[PDB]
Design a binder for this molecule. Structure first.
Ligand code: NAG
Length: 468
């Protein structure tokens, strides 16, 4: 982001959209006991008696796992909205599904009903899915080729920002109070309101207007504002060319995924990229981090502070990945991140197997956990978000993003509700599976995905064609 209008527009779009995804993704795991207690007190008030712990477990599983389900529905909904309202109107309508549930969760304690907390989780999941499938389109189409990587990475940058802010605000001292959780839950609507107030002042993505709506005039002004001075003649010609080529060849339409043979490899590439992000071990590092820090000598009274430090490392590594996308490229970052993740998983399996015999291995274990956090943050987290939009053309982007988001959310939910059993069924060799999965994903990325840095979309489509 060089021009100030583009930087402000990117900040306003990402802060109100990706922050919802991150915050509602990780705001509930830490203060679980408080919500347990509130549910049980509401049930006591309503029925004048306690209820079974099985109903506690079922209700908690529902309210903690409806967010992936809401995200999956939302991902398959961005379709009906993205090409109907542009990235702009889609992001603006996405704010309703983040403002209404925020108010519902805010007035929930006085209303004395947990349902509003269970239904608002589904609504916020829908909002998060729509945001995750719409914000990358807006950021990629807004930015020029020279600065496309940083603006595209801003999506995951602000996702991690929201995750870190939610981790900070979810501590017992800050807002995890039995009388402070309504504010914690309702804080997710403030960025939504700010984006609703700020974003309309910024221009719609020029590519959608010219290539899809046909209004070159509007595109010109938006570009003038976003691109500033300089020149736009060439940029406009690119859009016109990409429009002419797309019209001549055709576009993806969901119902004909296999019919369009040209983008089959690209669809496979994006599907493989998103699954390798979710099924590549981050769940295990999370489940095993507490045990690793406990064995490291850290008392249980700081296993949190260590989680906050891990979040800080995640933030720093994501920002440095945003900086280095336009310098080292995308393929290099993907390969480096997946290799670091695989090596960390391997050495973590080694230390977990040999933790009891040699207590001195705990330092290597915590180093490996932090190394995995950093490596997954740099390569596999934001670069797929940047690449999912670079490969595909304009009109095919809706179908491509529908498939990509559906796969991402489905893999997220599936792996989330399996590792528990796997952890038990297998032991620590779970990490070898993941470090296998990471190795396979890195091999596929090296073999198939080419370099798309500093290249317009017509070129990148040409490159993929030659691949096969
Ligand atoms: C439902 C459940 O998990 N058990 C709770 C438990 O917190 C405690 O025995 C008591 C506190 O008031 O209320 C029970 O219903």
């Amino acid at each position: 982001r060089l021009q100030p209008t583009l930087l402000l527009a990117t900040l306003s779009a990402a802060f109100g959209s990706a922050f919802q995804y991150g915050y509602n993704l990780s705001v509930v795991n830490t203060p679980h006991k408080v919500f347990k207690s509130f549910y049980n007190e509401t049930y006591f008030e309503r029925h004048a008696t306690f209820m079974d712990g099985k109903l506690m477990l079922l209700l908690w599983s529902c309210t903690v796992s409806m967010f992936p389900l809401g995200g999956l529905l939302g991902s398959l909904l961005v379709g009906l909205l993205v090409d109907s309202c542009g990235r702009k109107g889609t992001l603006l309508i996405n704010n309703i599904f983040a403002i209404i549930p925020a108010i519902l969760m805010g007035v929930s304690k006085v209303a004395k009903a947990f349902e509003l907390i269970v239904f608002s989780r589904v609504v916020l999941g829908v909002c998060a899915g729509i945001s995750y499938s719409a914000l990358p389109m807006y950021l990629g189409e807004l930015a020029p080729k020279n600065l496309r990587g940083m603006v595209g990475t801003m999506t995951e940058v602000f996702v991690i920002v929201g995750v870190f802010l939610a981790q900070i605000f979810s501590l017992q001292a800050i807002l995890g109070n039995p009388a402070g959780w309504p504010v914690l839950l309702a804080l997710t609507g403030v960025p939504a309101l700010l984006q609703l107030l700020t974003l309309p002042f910024f221009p719609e993505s020029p590519r959608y207007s010219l290539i899809q709506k046909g209004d070159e005039a509007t595109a010109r002004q938006a570009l003038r504002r976003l691109r500033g001075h300089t020149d736009m003649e060439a940029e406009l010609e690119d859009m016109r060319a990409e429009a002419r080529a797309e019209r001549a060849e055709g576009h993806l339409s969901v119902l004909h995924l296999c019919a369009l043979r040209s983008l089959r490899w690209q669809l496979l590439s994006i599907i493989v990229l998103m699954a390798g992000q979710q099924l590549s071990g981050i769940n295990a590092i999370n489940y095993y981090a507490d045990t690793i820090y406990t064995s490291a000598g850290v008392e249980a009274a700081h296993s949190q502070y260590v989680t906050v430090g891990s979040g800080v490392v995640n933030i720093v590594m994501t920002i440095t990945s945003a900086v280095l996308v336009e310098r080292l490229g995308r393929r290099h970052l993907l390969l480096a991140g997946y290799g670091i993740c695989g090596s960390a998983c391997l050495v973590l399996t080694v230390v977990l197997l040999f933790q009891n015999r040699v207590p001195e291995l705990s330092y290597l274990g915590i180093i490996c956990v932090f190394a995995y956090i950093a490596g997954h943050s740099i390569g596999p987290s934001p670069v797929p978000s940047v690449v999912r939009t670079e490969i595909f053309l304009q009109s095919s982007r809706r179908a491509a993003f529908m498939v990509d988001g559906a796969v991402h959310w489905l893999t997220n939910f599936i792996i989330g509700f399996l590792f528990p059993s796997i952890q038990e069924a297998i032991g620590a060799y779970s990490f070898i599976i993941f470090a296998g999965i990471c190795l396979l994903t890195a091999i596929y990325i090296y073999v198939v995905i080419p370099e798309t840095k500093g290249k317009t979309f017509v070129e990148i489509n040409r490159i993929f064609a030659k691949r096969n």
